[PDB]
Write a protein that binds this ligand. Structure first.
Ligand code: SF4
Ligand SMILES: [Zn+2]
Ligand SMILES: [Zn+2]
Ligand SMILES: [Zn+2]
Ligand SMILES: [Zn+2]
Lengths: 754, 351
């Protein structure tokens, strides 16, 4: 299609369009005109990516100013979905117009999946794979390689052929999807990691996980050339406020404290051994500290940086000498004085949430170490370690967390919280204290990204209401509007099973345990679906531990064989590797004749990134209300902070947040308007939260569907499937919800110009 | 408010000389009380109807039957041109009851090799009656899917009031990638029409393939009764026929000769396809007022056509189904029955 929004061609890759899309198209350009925030709700059943990319890509190719576009998704899995979608649209944009791209657009996932060196790629741990190639292709290791001819230092050689051919230009013209990128890079024996690392200043659009925008330790290479005058795009960003606070979160364990002593004592050996050999550089680095923060070679580091910037990207940084901490022996001494004080603060017999100030003052009372120099731990460690040119990190892995933490808490106050549990309640009565620490307001990290740009886009099919987030992140949008699914057919049956076959108000809030009155009713309720439902059916527990709780007794119950006698059952596994193998086989079985049934957690990772088409998404299950206070009052602590900071209480936020995570899972049942699937839910309180739903979801929910019985619901979904299974192809009223190819959008919307 | 196909793209190559072995499920799934006796017994009732009608509408085709019981498929009828052997088989199968589960792949391959001896002109096709939601496959179905499509055998199947994506894919995969063959039921009459539309040949757009001529002869009836003697069954036949070439006393059968193996047919089967080959356009219901034609039926004598300004009775409609080619009307009862039974448009027949 090629229509206009009164200013720009719209090279829409599909012949068909949708009424939401043009309304989506109407607002995106309108928002694009006035760079703001404009939080909008677009139904996930429609593919917003097409409406997303098409108007934006044209906008850059029509308006000649915004040469850089930024999209931040939740998962790199979404990135490759966007990567091919852009690639297809880029092909289509060329297809409709010829060759008018000259465009650079690539994803960004990690070094782990982009380090093409097989040995480094073979390693499992993401830290090591990063660290290995960091060491394998290091600014100093290559010196140990180039200056001293030796086999001691090897290289990825992908970074080298990067420096040979790749660091003169870009990859020729492709908008490389991850498969296409990896296929190309491997044939060029290239490193897509270092490629995008240097391609930061070259990609006309960049797609990556929110963390590269959010996580300052990886949101630190930010170049204002691609950032300042760019547009920021967010979808499904509702479950990111937690991520933001998670990005500032930090859990500690006395074992790691001993690991810290393991590293910190090893530092004493490391600094002493080089001191006998070459302390002159260390003395020279003291002068490099005497001149300042040694930004000459603590930032100008091709592959040198040991400690990254865990704090926000150098906003709250001082650069003077650290007084006496200039000496490494002194530097470790306060650190060694600290870790034991930390241990002395870790050994608390009960749970204590210590204020950042009082705890710091308490430290000062115990170990008189000043706050401002304490932030220098991160820079000093990154500085010192490379000067030590250590050959290992595992002993020092605990240390960078301290360099993270000690800088963090010394930088952060009255927006963060240090809390020292004496153990974990799930394994209480044993000594396992955690010195848990995190932020409280998510907007704190959002404020710099708020500050840096005006044109920012946020979208979700789940966000409801669209007002908590402006309250939460303390910002003003332009358009706070929700889109409804223009469907002339049901295509999904929202079902609230408050009452079971027993007509019992059934819930997950009662306990995190089993009661067969509710549970066996649930088990009996579930099995009838296995017979009637086709391949594709998933459950979402409120908690993984709660998930396992119900599993064993149902396994003990005879309920287990019949569903196997009906379909295939695949579990959620703590390792995603087995889970992935389950997932593909589940989809394979879903693609296969033998039916497949799944089971997950509403907080599980599947609800985060994994979508399911018509066949793959057929019958979603919400196992009770997804609730999170199974854990401690750290939720309440932030919530109490939330309650005092914002006039939002627990349950209101909880219902908002729980249904947000509930709706987070439910968005994965749909692929397009061709897709469909009944949306069953089983909890007594589900009837109350009819308002908390997103509009189209709430619109799709009739009031007659509340507190339904499973038996009556079984009849309800019974007819739905056959009707949907029936080839409902009117081909005349479809154009009402299709806005027939290049005509109705041209005709109707231009008619609707009044 | 009309439920009609916009146009009928019949005009050319369809499935006429057919080799269909429909496969049934005989499982606990067919045992359940979804239909009044059950699925299976009503289905066996339903299935019986099509057999003769298949041999009625398509006497030029051959057919056997296979079922699937207890995770295993079982052939239950030989591919033949006589309904009776197939017909009598179901009577035992009627008195037989479905059991266990169906094995799709067992049916997949048992039927697959079953259709190997079929000639090219005899069109290979399979239809499935399935009630469960999962299969019983000894191996890779997609391999068998690959094997079947490599054999160039399009297939339509009809599951129960539900959908199976691979079955939706299979009917797609079998039929040149065109998915119009996984239609499922929602009602017994809606199931009855499935039989009714099944007897029709299958034109969509046949790829330009090798088209083969056919040579045979007509049979010549035997007259004597007391001379009872048979050769195709070594019996005594109180009346029979004679092969055009082998010249064997053969009982009444439009089948192939048993001695020199040539098809024996008189005239009837041939013209059955002809009205199928070139059907008519539906008699267009002429308007209530814009027609203003003779106030009577054309094929029949239905003087009443509307109600003449009778509020809504006349504003309802006008039973004026008019064939376009003849430009002559027909009462709906006449016109529908015409297109139902005998195309033979008298207005078009008269010239
Ligand atoms: S040089 Fe490239 S391929 Fe080798 S480990 Fe480093 S990033 Fe990976
Ligand atoms: Zn005989
Ligand atoms: Zn003969
Ligand atoms: Zn008539
Ligand atoms: Zn006519």
């Amino acid at each position: 299609m090629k229509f206009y929004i009164d200013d720009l061609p719209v090279l829409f890759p599909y012949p068909k369009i949708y009424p939401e899309q043009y309304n989506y198209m109407c607002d995106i350009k309108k928002t694009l005109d006035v760079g703001g925030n404009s939080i909008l709700e677009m139904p996930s059943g429609t593919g917003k990516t097409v409406s997303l990319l098409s108007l934006t890509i044209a906008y850059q190719m029509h308006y000649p100013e915004h040469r850089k576009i930024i999209y931040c998704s939740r998962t790199m899995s979404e990135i490759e979905k966007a990567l091919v979608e852009l690639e297809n649209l880029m092909d289509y944009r060329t297809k409709e117009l010829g060759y008018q791209e000259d465009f650079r657009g690539l994803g960004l996932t990690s070094r782990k999946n982009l380090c093409l060196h097989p040995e480094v790629s073979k390693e499992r741990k993401g830290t090591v794979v990063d660290e290995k190639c960091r060491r394998m292709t290091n600014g100093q290791a290559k010196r140990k390689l180039e200056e001293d001819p030796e086999a001691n230092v090897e290289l990825c050689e992908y970074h080298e052929n990067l420096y040979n051919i790749e660091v003169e230009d870009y990859l020729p013209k492709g908008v490389f999807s991850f498969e296409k990128l990896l296929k190309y890079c491997e044939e060029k024996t290239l490193c897509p990691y270092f490629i995008v690392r240097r391609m930061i200043s070259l990609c006309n659009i960049i797609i990556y996980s929110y963390h590269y925008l959010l996580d300052p330790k990886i949101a630190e290479r930010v170049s204002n050339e691609v950032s300042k005058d760019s547009i920021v795009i967010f979808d499904e960003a509702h479950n990111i406020d937690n991520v933001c606070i998670e990005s500032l979160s930090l859990d500690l364990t006395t074992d790691a404290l001993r690991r810290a002593t393991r590293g910190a004592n090893a530092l004493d050996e490391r600094i002493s051994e080089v001191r006998k050999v070459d302390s002159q550089k260390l003395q020279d680095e003291y002068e490099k500290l005497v001149q300042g923060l040694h930004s000459a070679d603590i930032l100008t580091d091709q592959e040198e940086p040991f400690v990254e910037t865990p704090v926000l990207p150098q906003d709250l940084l001082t650069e003077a000498i650290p007084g006496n901490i200039r000496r490494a022996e002194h530097f470790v001494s306060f650190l060694k004085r600290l870790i034991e004080y930390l241990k002395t603060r870790m050994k608390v017999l009960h749970v204590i949430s210590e204020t950042p100030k009082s705890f710091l003052q308490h430290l000062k009372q115990l170990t008189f170490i000043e706050r401002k120099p304490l932030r220098f731990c991160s820079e000093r460690l990154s500085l010192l370690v490379r000067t030590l040119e250590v050959t290992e990190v595992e002993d020092f892995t605990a240390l960078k967390d301290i360099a993270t933490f000690a800088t963090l808490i010394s930088t952060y106050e009255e927006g963060f919280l240090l809390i020292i549990e004496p153990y974990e309640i799930e394994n209480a009565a044993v000594p396992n204290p955690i010195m848990r620490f995190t932020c409280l307001d998510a907007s704190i990290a959002i404020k710099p990204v708020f500050e840096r740009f005006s044109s920012v886009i946020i979208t979700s099919g789940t966000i409801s209401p669209l007002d908590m987030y402006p309250r939460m992140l303390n910002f003003k949008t332009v358009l706070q509007k929700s889109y409804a699914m223009t469907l002339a057919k049901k295509s999904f049956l929202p079902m609230i099973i408050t009452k079971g076959s027993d007509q019992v108000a059934i819930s997950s809030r009662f306990e995190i345990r089993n009661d067969p009155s509710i549970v066996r009713n649930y088990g009996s309720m579930l099995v009838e679906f296995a017979k009637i439902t086709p391949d594709g059916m998933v459950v979402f527990f409120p908690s993984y531990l709660y998930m396992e709780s119900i599993v064993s007794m149902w396994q003990t119950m005879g309920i287990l064989d019949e569903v196997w006698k009906h379909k295939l059952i695949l579990v959620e596994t703590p390792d995603a590797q087995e889970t992935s193998l389950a997932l593909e086989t589940y989809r394979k079985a879903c693609s296969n004749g033998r039916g497949a049934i799944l089971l997950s957690v509403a907080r599980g990772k599947v609800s985060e990134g994994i979508d399911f088409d018509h066949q793959y998404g057929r019958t979603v299950l919400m196992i009770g209300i997804p609730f999170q206070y199974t854990e401690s009052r750290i939720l309440k602590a932030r919530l109490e902070f939330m309650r005092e900071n914002y006039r939002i209480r627990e349950n209101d936020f909880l219902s908002f947040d729980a249904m947000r995570h509930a709706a987070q899972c439910l968005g994965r049942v749909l692929r397009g308007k061709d897709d469909y699937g009944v949306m069953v839910l089983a909890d007594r309180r589900f009837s109350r939260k009819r308002s908390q739903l997103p509009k189209w979801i709430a619109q799709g929910l009739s009031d007659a569907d509340l507190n339904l019985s499973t038996d009556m619901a079984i009849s309800n979904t019974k007819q739905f499937l056959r009707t949907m299974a029936q080839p409902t192809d009117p081909k005349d009223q479809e154009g009402v919800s299709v806005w027939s190819y290049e005509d109705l959008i041209k005709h109707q919307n231009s008619r609707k110009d009044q | 408010k009309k439920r009609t196909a916009k146009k009928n793209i019949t005009p050319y190559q369809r499935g006429i000389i057919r080799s269909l072995i429909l496969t049934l499920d005989c499982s606990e799934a067919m045992l359940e009380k979804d239909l009044r006796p059950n699925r299976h017994a009503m289905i066996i009732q339903y299935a019986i109807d099509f057999v003769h009608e298949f041999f009625d509408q398509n006497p030029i085709s051959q057919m056997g039957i296979i079922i699937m019981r207890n995770g295993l498929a079982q052939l239950v009828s030989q591919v033949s041109g006589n309904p009776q052997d197939h017909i009598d088989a179901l009577k035992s199968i009627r008195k037989q009851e479905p059991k266990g589960n169906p094995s799709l792949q067992n049916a997949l391959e048992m039927a697959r090799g079953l259709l190997l001896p079929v000639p090219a002109h005899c069109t290979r096709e399979v239809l499935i009656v399935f009630g469960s939601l999962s299969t019983t496959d000894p191996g890779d179905i997609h391999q068998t899917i690959d094997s079947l499509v490599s054999e160039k055998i399009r297939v339509k199947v009809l599951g129960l009031s539900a959908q199976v994506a691979i079955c939706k894919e299979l009917c797609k995969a079998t039929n040149y990638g065109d998915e119009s063959f996984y239609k499922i039921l929602l009602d017994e009459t809606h199931l009855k029409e499935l039989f009714n539309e099944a007897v029709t040949p299958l034109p969509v757009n046949k790829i330009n393939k090798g088209f083969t001529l056919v040579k045979m002869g007509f049979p010549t009836r035997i007259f004597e009764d007391t001379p009872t003697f048979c050769s195709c069954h070594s019996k005594l036949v109180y009346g029979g026929y004679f092969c055009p070439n082998c010249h064997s006393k053969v009982c009444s059968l439009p089948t192939v000769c048993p001695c020199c193996d040539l098809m024996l047919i008189l005239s009837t089967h041939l013209a059955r396809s002809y009205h199928h080959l070139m059907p008519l356009k539906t008699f267009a219901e002429v308007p209530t007022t814009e027609k203003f034609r003779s106030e009577d039926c054309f094929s029949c004598q239905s003087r009443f056509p509307x109600x003449x300004x009778x509020x809504x009775x006349x504003x309802x409609x006008x039973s004026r189904y008019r064939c376009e080619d003849c430009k002559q009307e027909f009462c709906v009862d006449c016109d529908v029955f015409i297109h139902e039974i005998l195309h033979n448009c008298p207005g078009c027949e008269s010239k």
